[PDB]
Design a protein around this ligand. Structure first.
Ligand code: FAD
Ligand code: FAD
Ligand code: CL
Ligand code: CL
Ligand code: ZN
Ligand code: ZN
Lengths: 467, 467
């Protein structure tokens, strides 16, 4: 029997970052992955693939609609979908090799197979051929991640009634793509194919898109996506999804109770993500789940079995890749006798549409439900000289500040490069900065971040300069 | 003779922002501009025009070199140079109307003409036809800005031997553009026409481009610009620039003393910018200049005449647009009896090439010259999943931290979206953040700002995760 200090089950962003941090702290560490390659959901069927298709489709969007204005003379651009998907596949293969490299550099043992608990200290690793080996580990970090949710009445066929996994591998640009469900994934992949020529209709039970974010962002994102051609059927309860050859028929009822029928040639189900624990052998180690199917954890991400921890999508909190990464570093440093901290209020959330959407801190709805006295500052992206020069003019920056102390309580962005502008707000809130603090700091001109500076001026005293 | 509390000579970013900040504080404010429209250098012949052409030319670069890999099918793209410039002119016209809106909204009086001092309290405003009006102002803010520098043997002709002003309005894509000076302006305008098909040769007297920035950024920017097709003749002292019909011949000597000759059809002189005070009548008010031609200032940007202040490119400091803006707000708030402060160490500098370059704080060369014990952190952009997805893999993030306290002393970036990532570093240093602090803060995944977190991990304890 091989012996290790720490075992990590799952090779997603939480898993392999946790392993590296365990190796850096001196633990003999092993990581177990059932997939053929390392990287988890985010690399193989998640973040990296979506960003690659989003980047290529946005290039296609510019060529089709803005090149003439930009002074670039081309004929009607055409989509080579096989090259798009193939290039994305190479991007995934690139990142997988980098993760392999990191494992070797940190002297982490990598085992391919399904890891199941035999006890609180023994783990069975079953390879593809069915053979098994048992290893011993003093501590174990569960990082098994999540799987796509679905609806029980939908029969997924991996052809036309699909999830994000297959949607990233289409053999053609859909004529009419139907998106069932209000997950972020649906809006991102819908943007990809909307740009590539598809008709996209989002059919959703929820009353607004991205409802977990600030309401202004919900409003502005639907406003800009409609402007781009996406159609939205909100507050609509789907009751059926039929495949009839080359056609999918979605039947539902609207908020007034009337019947609704939507037909397309492709249907993507994006109704959320579900924690994944199948085959993990939790009963044999004694680890408890909650009513939602998540590994119960305490303040130290510890299960009821003291030597077993759990991180990432398999536990409570925002199901984000960098949230799993931070929790992995947290457990490793905790195992080393340190006292780390995670501020979950300061974990940003990003939507990778164009314009990008990003938020950190409290939403206005959260401040209202708590009876917090707050100020609002708001500056539009179209007023920036940088946006006029690039034609990326959609969106707004919104800052919430405590009315008495001026401390920034939440920053909510929709606009060009918001996925990276949000970092300024994260650092600002980490140092408990006031709106006045940010308003007085130099922001490079011309940049999109000047909208943050202007919004902070608006929040601190309604004294923005460029509005 | 009308009376005002504050008069502002110049409608640049410093000029008009100061006027707005003065109007917000309750002062009767008037602003004078000799140009036909408002905006100063940055709007009409500076930041906005160049940024517009950089965005258009980068699109053309993608269509020519990356669209096929992206899966976008087009024929060879062609340049409509008249349309490029026309759109840029429209962006300038857009922004000019916005400044007009801001002046009227803040109830600032706008006068067109040359502003000249009659005394420390009277200012003559001379229109083009010769008519004059004299105004009285308790205080005056000098914001007359800058002009392109040149060399005594250079005869500028506004056709083929040109400055930045004319290069932004070319009627054809150059066959071979010669750039004299490796400054921010020269590299940006060279990149514009390089992408559009021109051959670009940069001739620079110093041994490195952008020498006012960190040496790593100098090296990496030259490394990538060469990869993009730019040619560089460094350590080269130009001694003659003659126009011979449709061709310009630049004669110089290399580091070995051997003669060097470069021929092109367009020659851009980018040897820096010089403070502009022509016709301002400073002698009639008593305001003294320094040896370099700049309006002398003290701690409060005050001249020797106590009621007259000066800001922007006409005074000491980095000749940057947001530097003029901040100094305009500083003088305005100082006039109001408040006690503001400008931290010149925390004013970022941006080069809008692709990849973008940005730095803030001390350079490594400065830390060496001061004998500061420092740590270095460095993460490459090609290792980010986000960069792999977009194919924007060039560059590095470099963080300098104090060896004893771990406090970040400077952050230097070359990579995608550096123009907006630098904002995180500015806010970080403003709060005296340590390398460990940034390394522990949540960074959205996948984003380019993750390279900042990784570089901070490298600086704080050589413990980056993805390297
Ligand atoms: C299309 C899509 C786009 C997304 N885009 C983003 C985005 O832009 N940003 C973002 O932050 N998040 C995004 N996400 C979410 C992101 O993928 C997750 O939040 C993140 O991957 C969390 O991963 P993790 O480490 O907790 O586990 P996971 O990445 O979900 O994977 C855990 C791993 O455990 C392995 N495993 C499970 N059980 C066993 C077992 N018994 N034995 C061995 N191995 C096992 C699995 O094979 C899997 O590889 C996206 C998701 C999808 C699907
Ligand atoms: C091609 C180019 C690109 C640049 N890009 C950038 C960039 O990306 N970022 C950046 O920060 N900086 C950039 N700069 C520099 C930027 O333009 C200046 O730093 C900024 O404009 C500072 O302006 P200011 O208020 O100090 O004065 P200015 O904008 O230089 O001009 C003030 C105005 O005063 C007027 N004036 C002068 N004397 C008188 C008088 N006696 N009476 C009446 N009117 C008068 C002038 O006509 C002028 O319009 C760039 C410069 C150039 C040339
Ligand atoms: Cl602005
Ligand atoms: Cl990373
Ligand atoms: Zn500005
Ligand atoms: Zn990451």
């Amino acid at each position: 029997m091989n012996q290790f200090d720490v075992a990590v089950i799952g090779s997603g962003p939480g898993g392999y970052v946790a392993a590296i941090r365990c190796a850096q702290l001196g633990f003999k560490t092993v990581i177990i992955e059932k997939y053929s390659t390392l990287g988890g959901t985010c690399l193989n069927v998640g973040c990296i693939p979506s960003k690659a298709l989003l980047d290529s489709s946005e290039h296609f969007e510019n060529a089709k609609h803005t090149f003439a204005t930009h002074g670039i003379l081309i004929d009607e651009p055409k989509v080579d979908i096989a090259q798009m998907i193939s290039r994305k596949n190479d991007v995934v293969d690139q990142t997988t090799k980098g993760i392999n490299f990191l494992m070797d550099k940190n002297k982490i043992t990598v085992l391919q197979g399904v890891g199941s608990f035999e006890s609180a200290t023994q783990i069975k690793v079953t390879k593809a051929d069915g053979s098994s080996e048992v290893i011993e580990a003093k501590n174990t970090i569960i990082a098994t991640g999540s799987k796509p949710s679905s609806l029980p009445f939908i029969t997924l066929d991996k052809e036309r009634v699909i999830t994000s996994t297959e949607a990233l591998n289409l053999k053609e640009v859909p004529k009419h793509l139907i998106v069932i469900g209000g997950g972020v994934i649906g809006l991102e992949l819908g943007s990809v194919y909307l740009r590539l020529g598809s008709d996209v209709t989002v059919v959703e039970y929820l009353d607004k898109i991205i409802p977990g974010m600030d309401g202004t962002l919900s409003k502005e994102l639907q406003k800009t996506l409609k402007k781009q051609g996406m159609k939205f059927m909100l507050s609509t309860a789907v009751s059926g999804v039929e495949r009839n050859g080359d056609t999918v028929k979605v039947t539902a009822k609207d908020k007034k109770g009337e019947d609704v029928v939507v037909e397309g040639d492709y249907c993507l189900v994006s109704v959320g993500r579900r924690p994944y624990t199948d085959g993990l052998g939790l009963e044999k180690a004694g680890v408890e789940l909650d009513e939602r199917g998540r590994v119960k954890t305490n303040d130290h991400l510890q299960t009821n079995v003291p030597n077993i921890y759990a991180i990432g999508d398999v536990v409570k909190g925002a199901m984000l890749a960098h949230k799993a990464e931070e929790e992995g570093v947290f457990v490793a440093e905790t195992l080393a006798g340190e006292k780390p901290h995670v501020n979950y209020n300061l974990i940003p959330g990003v939507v990778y549409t164009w314009p990008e959407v990003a938020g950190v801190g409290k939403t206005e709805e959260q401040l209202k439900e708590a009876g917090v006295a707050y100020k609002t500052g708001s500056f539009p992206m179209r007023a920036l000289g940088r946006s006029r020069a690039s034609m990326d003019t959609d969106g707004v920056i919104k800052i919430l500040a405590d009315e008495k102390t001026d401390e920034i309580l939440g920053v909510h962005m929709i606009g060009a490069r918001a996925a990276d502008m949000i970092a300024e707000a994260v650092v600002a809130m980490e140092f408990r900065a006031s709106a006045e603090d940010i308003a007085r700091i130099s922001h490079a001109h011309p940049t999109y971040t000047e909208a943050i500076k202007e919004a902070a001026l608006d929040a601190t005293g309604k004294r923005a300069i460029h509005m």
